[PDB]
Amino acid sequence: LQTLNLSPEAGRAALGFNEWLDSNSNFSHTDETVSFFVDYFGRRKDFKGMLEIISKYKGIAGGKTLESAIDRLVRAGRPKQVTDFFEKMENDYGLKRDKESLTLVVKKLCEKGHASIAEKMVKNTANEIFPDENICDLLISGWCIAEKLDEATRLAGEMSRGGFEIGTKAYNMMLDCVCKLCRKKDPFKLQPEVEKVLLEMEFRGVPRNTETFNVLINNLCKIRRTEEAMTLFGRMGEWGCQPDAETYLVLIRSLYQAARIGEGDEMIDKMKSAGYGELLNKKEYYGFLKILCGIERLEHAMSVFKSMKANGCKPGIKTYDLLMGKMCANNQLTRANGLYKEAAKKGIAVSPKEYRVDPRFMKKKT
RNA sequence: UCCAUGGAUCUCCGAUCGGGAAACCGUAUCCAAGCUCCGUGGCUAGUCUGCGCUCUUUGGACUUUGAAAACUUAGCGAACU
């Protein structure tokens, strides 16, 4: 589209000529597509040209444009200039220095970790905009992204020193950072911290909603501790929770990784029989086929492969351009072509690529 | 219990990676190709699409050292008597 014409403008004079034909002739710039222009600059890194076009148009309709522009400035990574452009946002009127603009830049910066600049700007302009409970919760998430758990706990003990109070999402973020640092500095230092953060939820009365169980399982699967995780998914009953896409996919994983093919199958079907799995993925099948193609488990691989065929979904070439590849890397004892008969000739509909499968693993097992 | 076969573990010096006051004290690389793991870039988010790491294990080539009684064949070569 016009966006894929802007992309081959690997050059700013190109955008000069094209914007001349757009605003003055094509009448497209006469729209928020100023957003797409300044974002072209925001990936060109030339936020100077970004502000050039901002100053050019300068019509007061740049809501989406200015919020995407700050999204640029934060990913292109200059928070100092980002706050500068907040003041410039006042002076440019495309936004309003209001609760909504502020509570949007908060989520613009809370996805990278620049909570220092963010907190300074919010705790200065909360002389005109105090009530920002969105920001109130989000700063904990931003500082969790920055992982500076001292600054996390300081935001906590300070929000306690105000009209604000701590919430479930805050404790989820805190536990995210806690278990991340635990499993990435000492695994056995993870064991006590989970309670040392859940009891916080408890004394705040916080409900341990299924997001928290997502947190537990997702920070227990990277640690090859999945028996505790499966048993937690069992005990999902006590608190007013239930499964989710996260939990079911991640408990199919890390149940494969630990030689539990049987329960793996069972729990795929339990995902579907809980009903959230009306779309597992076009990809997850290939994923935990990479799993059990890594561990030399092609037998149960073809097993779950007929299972996904009976699910019906069509595995793209993605599976086939590597399955016989694994079957023929499976040649320290060579079962290669006796199952080449089963999947290389097959793939009837994409038969040229299905035969193409041969020279690749042949070039690996020359 | 027990026999035979074949498998499991199998501490140390002698010693042979370095030190050593014998039985004790210190410690892999390079390169391919493997899922996991951990951030990185993509902004074009498209199997959302791709890079580069690690600990490890395989499987190689680098990475490397062996002893005895008499017998034999040699090199030396004596005095007592």
Closest CA to A281 of A313, A312, A304: A313
Compute the residue count for chain A: 366
Torsions phi, psi of A62, nearest 5? -95, 40
The secondary structure of chain A, three-state, reads CHHHHHCCCCCHHHHHHHHHHHHHHHCCCCCCCHHHHHHHHHHHCCHHHHHHHHHHHCCCCCHHHHHHHHHHHHHCCCHHHHHHHHHHHHHHCCCCCCHHHHHHHHHHHCCCCCHHHHHHHHHHHCCCCCCCHHHHHHHHHHHHHCCCHHHHHHHHHHHCCCCCCCCHHHHHHHHHHHHHHHHCCCHHHCHHHHHHHHHHHHHCCCCCCHHHHHHHHHHHHCCCCCHHHHHHHHHHHCCCCCCCHHHHHHHHCCCCCCCCHHHHHHHHHHHHHHCCHHHCCCCHHHHHHHCCCCCCCHHHHHHHHHHHHHHCCCCCHHHHHHHHHHHHHCCCCCCCHHHHHHHCCCCHHHHHHHHHHHHHHHHHCC
Q: Kindly provide the resolution of this structure in angstroms, with one decimal.
A: 3.9
Cβ contact A144 with chain B strand, < 7 A: no
Q: How far is CA A158 from CA A116, A117, A148, A196, in A?
A: 15, 17, 15, 19
Task: Identify residues after which chain A is interrupted (C–N over 2.5 A).
Answer: none
Rounded CA-CA distance A254/A263 in Å is: 11
A360 touches strand B (CB under 7 A): no
Query: How far is it, in rounded angstroms, from Cα A226 to Cα A251?
Result: 8
R_g (Cα) of chain A, nearest Å: 26
CA A188 to C1' B13, in angstroms, rounded, equals 39
In this complex, the answer to whether residue A249 has its CB under 7 A from any atom of chain B, a nucleic strand, is no
First to last CA, chain A: 46
d(CA A250, CA A264): 11
Which of chain A's residues 63-82 bind strand B, using a 7 Å CB cutoff? 75
Reference A311, options A330, A286, A290, A285; nearest CA is: A285
Amino acid, res. A122: V
Q: Which tokens belong to A107?
A: 């989520």
Question: What would the 3-class secondary structure string for A323-366 be?
Answer: HHHHHHHCCCCCCCHHHHHHHCCCCHHHHHHHHHHHHHHHHHCC
Contact in structure between A276 and A243 (CB atoms under 8 Å): yes
Taking the C-alpha atoms of residue A272 and residue A288, their distance in angstroms, rounded to an integer, is 16
Integer Cα distance of A99 and A133 in angstroms: 10
Which bases on strand B have an atom closer than 7 Å to a protein beta carbon?
33-39, 43-44, 47-48, 58-59
The answer to whether A362 CB is within 7 Å of strand B is no
Distance CA A287, CA A318 (A): 10
Handedness of CA A84, A89, A90, A91 (dihedral sign): positive
Measured from the CB, is A363 under 7 Å from any atom of strand B? no
Q: Go through A266-304 and write b for each residue having 16 or more CB atoms within 10 A of its CB, e for each that does not.
A: ebbebbeeeebbeebeeebbbebbebbbeeebbebbbeb
Distance from C-alpha of A159 to C-alpha of A174, rounded to nearest angstrom:
14
Between CA A140 and C1' B57 the distance (Å) reads 42
**Tokens 């097992």 belong to which residue?**
A365
Instruction: Give the Cα separation of A229 and A253 in Å (integer).
Output: 11
**Does the C-beta of A45 come within 7 A of strand B?**
no
Please name the method used to determine this structure.
cryo-EM
| Residue A43 Cβ < 7 Å to strand B | yes
Contact yes or no for A189/A149 (Cβ under 8 A): no
